Symmetry: C4
Subunit: 354 residues, 4 copies
């Protein structure tokens, strides 16, 4: 058998602190979404039917990031969701807006869905997210070429991928960003069901190095549990991070609150779960704790990133990537990194152990 | 001390995705059981008294695979089981059949059991599976030589082994397939009791490299918990996979269904457990959740396999093995690979925790 | 990406035994706090509002160590705490005292707090501990320069750091000790929240190699759970150890004792927790078991240290560091090192699970 | 810091099966206890007050191994325990006997206990086990030299040690066997309390290589949980294994049976536990499950060893050591080695997971 390497993920590594003349409050967190679109902060909500519809994409863009409307609905519904975001108005000085001063929004499509693309363009979507379980596939590559041919000024994101060869193929196909992540999603069983995938830190590292040669941003999609993971993903070279599970428990995410055994929850499920698809399932249907507003979640997450960048001595994301040095740690190191030998009595807003 | 390598198993590795032009529904999954016997799908039910009798064996063959009738019964009883399969009769277009249109079946034998082989050969058995806890032994090798001498056109599988040296010995003795696995079985305590074994992925890899020289296919036997493990075993170069615990919960497996504290189960035990031997055991007696029909289980398992081959861009298994690249992962990598940070509310058909 | 090393912590290593001619009762455990301040035993209580006020500080000093009064209070209050220690009065023959026979005490300060330093220096403080979550910063380094300029004979400790580069910066700025530890603290979430830190053993090792060039002692701060960790920290070359969770359960720590579900506790929280800050926290609020007096805790901890030095054959700490050889262990090695395969019925004074 | 090596213990390694012309029933398991004393099988019960008094040492020797009477009693009591074993009579054809046809027995002593040694010699003890928490110490080395000087034909065992230099010092001191094990005992907190110790497989490996140059057997003392560990310890080069926890729950071991929450137990405690010593404790006081007779325990343990040797192709222990090849495994390998993905319904006599 051919073993190419030993691959690491988030928990395997930590950033080394460096000399710093910058306070966390002073750092700038703007970043590229694609080659032609800027975010005022690096978070994107996942294209999932238990995460991102209009209320969520509105908040995400008001806070300077992006929401991506899921494709588990007919064209007319998705169009209507996009218009709701575009026509939204308010306090949000970091808002992420197009040239008309309208909140930016993204919308998911799948292979061959060219009629959906047409409608979304005419609805004034800012970015189309072309998604497959296997981005490195002929269907995806062909779809990219068709979309760039018909809409040369439409910003196009394609994924998911996990290797440098995939990033090369997509970039040469004409994408404006690649999405990295095969298997690391909280609700994902892809690696278990089919044995395929690449640990997320290594996948991002590999793809970034290739995507850089084309001036193409990488989106790190899936597997983020804590703000520290966001920092690590960015430091390794990603330009933004896509998040589902950390947002699925918010007010704005689709679905109703429910209480079960004294706790509040919302539903969260893979788009490859049996429920969502109504191919063998590559995702599960579950529940996540209720966590209040998107605003409160994003605030804790960005505060973590700001801390990290303060520790590293970085003024902006690009400086963060140039300075960042990692150390690989052991299981015992991870155990020391978490809270240990104390029982938590009041839960912190940015650290929950289940 | 002499340490020859760091040895890996299923949970230590993942397959890298590759450029694909094939959809999962389009890939071909036929394979080889032995030099001369073909499978339409690569699964074999284990030769265990809680897994394979005639009902399981019939379903496995109708679906394109194979069942091996266990040997924890007298010769006559086993002859009868084999006969029920061979006499069995669009609905099963992938049925694995012999030149007469009869379902194929295998039967297990032990060292020096030529009387059992005689009666099985007479009963129309398609393949004989020579089983020992230690396939790399004088007893096993002599039995091989004697069987091939007396029945030269009888397909012979022997095991279990875990080293290239063992593979070489068996191939030179004249086997038509080798079975790999010392200690990975769900119900197995061999490694703990005797301190002996080789993590299943490295074992398959080592033995495939040796047996390939002789044109001898390798059966990966034991340690499969998920469809993804089937894919890995095949990608590393196994030609087929033998499965126990995943099928012991099925309607067709021997034994009755029972309910305990709100959950349904069937029994499952090692053939070296106390119960099965009736003494220093190398297996345990336990229970597995009821999972309904073998059909539904096989469907999900082949689903994952096809999906894997789609991800690798492999049109068939030879191509899969050719293209397959692995990456070694850490404990944190395994944790990320499983479902994490979400509570499952509706369990999936092909993923249980 | 740039990975500079595989970094280890306490549970990754063990000390090898060596030829010994010393019994544990015979070894000497005096050490250095700073270039100019001496300790009779090497423990310092953490500068936390659930660990060190005047009661703890007095006990730590009477036993030959030191307490650092925390800074989560106004300047006046902290001046008063420091004053209660300095005014405090065979029973304590190892008492750590200044040239006037007064117990020694330290006090914590933050970046740009020269007013606090002024009032502490006036109150007779023996050492000032300059604390920041990130000691390798322009703020900390400028504060050092300003303090040493204004009070050149005032012993100054600064931290926290975890790299040789940080150690070098601080030593050149003029500190009398560096404090090492980014993220190992029991109540600390820094590593999870910001992704930043260095496993404590490698951190100490890196910083000791740098600071030693300047004659500057290293304080290992955070992550101690057992006496054995104290030994390792010292053997790697720390001159002293700062301890939080192990002392938060004591009579003398601030806060009241309470009972919850049959067990006794006191509160313990990070100075960067929400509660202590009153916002994006880097600590948590929790509880630790009540453990009785500081004396009894320190007794057990120094017991393990002396035992360690006996095992290594070290007559004193310099000798310990000289002789110490480590071995790196695996997860299975750690499991064997703990109590295993037996249920504890009467808990030990110095081992809790 | 100086890191000499990465050290492995039992769970880190497995034996490779080899070509075999031998059945488990056919293999011979006799071994050297010391340079001048043979065991018919390689097990020794631990010198502990909750393991080995006369009833236990009698059974151990009848089965061909050895019991070592603990030293937590006055001289007269220990002498009387030794005589009880020596005067025992019975069915036990593998019995381990001196030249007078009396069951062999060993007795523990500590540094300087020369009067106890005299009494034990006069009681007809076969081997004296000189024990310290730190065998590589001047007190121990001096005691060895004094005992060999006064009783040149008395077989003398000394420990505990964990390094090649220790084995060299003891061998040159004149011992007839060295005992290896600092920290691996089930009830031991030495490694936690003082940070000192060496993972047991590495310790045995290191000491055996040194002890061999003197023709001195190594005893592997502590950390055995399963029969597989016995095989591994022997394959690495040890001549016998000392066991406490696996025997503490037997009829013959000191102490009464008790029932707590529907289970039967016996007490088991470190000799460095607070209870036993009545220095900071380096052991705990606990309980272990009741397991019936020593005969039934030893039978399962020896059957495991016989299997192992059958797998390796070994006719006797020395052949076992020459043939044995190990492979290092991962955490996932260990997980696969144990029972997994099945719930046990009838507990096996040689495999219990708690
Ligand atoms: O689409 C899924 C599973 N799946 C998912 C999903 C979503 C995110 C991550 C993983 N899987 N969503 C689905 C929706 C419908 C049907 C199948 C679905 N799996 C695969 C597997 C291999 C492929 C090879 C070439 C082309 C496409 C391939 C697709
Ligand atoms: O047969 C078993 C135990 N055992 C099993 C069994 C089945 C599958 C995997 C492991 N063990 N089934 C048994 C049925 C009856 C008696 C013993 C049995 N163990 C061994 C062990 C070493 C050997 C060395 C040379 C030749 C044969 C050897 C056999
Ligand atoms: O001070 C805290 C958090 N924090 C803490 C604390 C204490 C010990 C360990 C970690 N954090 N205590 C605080 C008290 C008030 C407000 C914030 C606090 N975090 C940071 C993070 C990055 C920095 C970079 C340059 C300079 C200062 C930086 C500070
Ligand atoms: O004797 C014990 C602890 N201890 C034990 C024990 C028994 C087995 C394993 C570990 N410790 N039994 C004891 C009985 C009484 C007092 C202390 C005891 N610990 C030490 C530690 C370092 C030493 C250095 C030189 C000489 C002797 C040393 C002893
Ligand atoms: O069902 C699925 N199977 C596998 N991955 C999925 C599925 N549905 C969504 N995803 C991915 O998982 C991500 C969410 O990851 P999370 O932030 O870790 O919960 C999404 O952005 C998708 O990339
Ligand atoms: O009692 C036993 N001890 C060791 N291996 C066994 C025993 N019984 C069956 N096996 C092996 O384990 C396999 C079943 O593995 P499973 O698929 O992991 O449950 C069988 O096909 C045999 O190779
Ligand atoms: O809230 C916090 N976040 C991170 N580190 C902290 C915090 N509060 C105290 N510390 C550090 O952690 C140490 C206590 O570590 P402990 O001995 O493991 O409990 C203190 O001495 C500080 O160095
Ligand atoms: O209290 C103690 N502390 C550390 N080791 C001990 C103590 N008492 C006995 N031992 C050792 O532990 C062994 C028992 O190991 P076990 O077979 O793993 O339970 C004994 O043979 C001694 O070598
Ligand atoms: Cl730096
Ligand atoms: Cl061989
Ligand atoms: Cl691990």
């Amino acid at each position: 058998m051919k073993i190419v390497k030993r691959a690491l993920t988030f928990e395997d590594v930590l950033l080394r602190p460096g000399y710093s003349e910058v306070l966390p409050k002073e750092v700038k967190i703007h970043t590229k979404l694609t080659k032609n679109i800027t975010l005022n902060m690096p978070l994107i909500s996942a294209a999932m039917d238990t995460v991102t519809e209009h209320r969520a994409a509105i908040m995400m863009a008001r806070l300077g990031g992006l929401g991506v409307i899921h494709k588990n609905m007919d064209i007319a519904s998705q169009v209507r969701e996009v218009k709701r975001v575009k026509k939204s108005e308010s306090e949000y000085p970091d808002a992420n807006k197009d040239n008309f001063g309208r909140l930016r929004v993204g919308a998911a499509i799948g292979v061959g869905q060219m009629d959906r693309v047409d409608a979304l363009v005419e609805a004034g979507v800012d970015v189309v997210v072309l998604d497959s379980a296997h981005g490195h596939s002929k269907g995806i590559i062909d779809t990219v070429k068709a979309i760039k041919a018909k809409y040369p000024n439409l910003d196009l994101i394609a994924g998911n991928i996990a290797t440098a060869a995939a990033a090369k193929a997509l970039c040469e196909a004409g994408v404006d960003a690649v999405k990295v992540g095969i298997g690391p999603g909280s609700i994902c069983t892809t690696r278990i069901v089919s044995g395929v995938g690449v640990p997320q830190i290594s996948a991002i590292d590999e793809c970034v190095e290739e995507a850089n040669k084309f001036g193409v941003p990488v989106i790190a999609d899936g597997g983020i549990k804590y703000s520290g993971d966001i920092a690590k993903a960015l430091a390794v070279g990603a330009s933004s991070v896509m998040i589902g599970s950390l947002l699925a428990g918010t007010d704005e995410s689709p679905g109703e609150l429910f209480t079960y055994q004294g706790r509040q929850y919302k539903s969260y499920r893979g788009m490859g779960s049996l429920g969502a698809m109504q191919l063998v399932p590559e995702g599960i249907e579950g529940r996540v704790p209720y966590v209040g507003s998107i605003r409160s979640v994003v605030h804790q997450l960005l505060g973590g990133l700001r801390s990290s960048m303060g520790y590293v001595g970085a003024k902006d994301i690009e400086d963060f990537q140039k300075r960042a040095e990692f150390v690989e740690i052991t299981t015992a190191g991870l155990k020391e990194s978490h809270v240990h030998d104390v029982t938590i009595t009041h839960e912190a807003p940015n650290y929950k152990v289940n």
